[PDB]
């Protein structure tokens, strides 16, 4: 909702946004009518998790979502490496700074 969308029949003039490209994730549109103003995502997160389960290994997603989700799954290996920094930091201090 923060990005302009440019129709193919206008000379680079904006008309709306990208809202309609993610509308198939949420099964109850009530929860996103004003999504940019929410402070509680428990209901929304719930419906998203149902979506992800329903299409897991179904072979039925539109290609633009297929790439986006595959990308997000590949990133899980980065999370694994990144979260080991707290241990590396602690080990460094006790063994290389304090020499213990």
């Amino acid at each position: 909702r923060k990005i302009h969308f440019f129709p193919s029949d206008l000379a680079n003039e904006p008309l709306g946004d990208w809202r309609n490209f993610f509308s198939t994730i949420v099964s109850d549109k009530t929860l996103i009518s004003d999504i940019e103003n929410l402070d509680d995502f428990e209901k929304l997160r719930g419906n998203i998790e149902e979506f992800l389960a329903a299409y897991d290994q179904s072979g039925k997603l539109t290609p633009h979502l297929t790439l986006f989700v595959s990308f997000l799954k590949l990133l899980e290996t980065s999370k694994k490496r990144f979260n080991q920094l707290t241990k590396r930091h602690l080990d460094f201090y006790y063994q290389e700074i304090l020499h213990l």
Binding site: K2, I3, H4, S8, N12, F41
Partner: protein
């Protein structure tokens, strides 16, 4: 910048003879690809803050971070409000916003650092409620930083 010239999303643009429609379609692709770049930019940004997150002098107010992307030639047109690209702190509040549960996350970081010295501030969790109401969350985090 990793795609070929044929795609039309690089610095040298796309030759005029190919017409407007193809130029428009290039604009549409740039929009799509920003969904992948904004996420990657966040992870790089998060590395730059490790020093602050674990600081003994003073930690940050946020636990998640983002960046403006400026090596794309038309970002001033792609974004509805270019103002945000002039200040990463405003951009963070707008794009991540509430998803960052700062009070709980800041306490977890502080408790870890305190534990490294074998100390323990658990009692502040309730003793401060006889002095202050909702305002204790801010007060307690300030006291923990001072202690370190």
């Amino acid at each position: 910048h990793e795609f070929p010239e044929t795609y039309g999303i690089s610095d040298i643009g796309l030759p005029p003879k190919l017409g407007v429609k193809r130029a428009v379609l290039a604009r549409q692709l740039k929009g799509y690809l920003l969904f992948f770049d904004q996420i990657l930019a966040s992870y790089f940004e998060h590395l730059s803050k490790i020093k602050s997150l674990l600081s003994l002098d003073q930690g940050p107010s946020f636990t998640y971070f983002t960046q403006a992307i400026k090596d794309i030639k038309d970002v001033e047109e792609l974004f509805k409000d270019p103002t945000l690209l002039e200040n990463d702190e405003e951009l963070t509040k707008s794009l991540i916003g509430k998803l960052d549960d700062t009070i709980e996350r800041r306490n977890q970081l502080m408790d870890h650092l305190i534990a490294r010295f074998a100390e323990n501030f658990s009692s502040y969790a309730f003793l401060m409620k006889f002095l202050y109401g909702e305002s204790t969350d801010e007060i307690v985090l300030q006291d923990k930083q001072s202690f370190l």
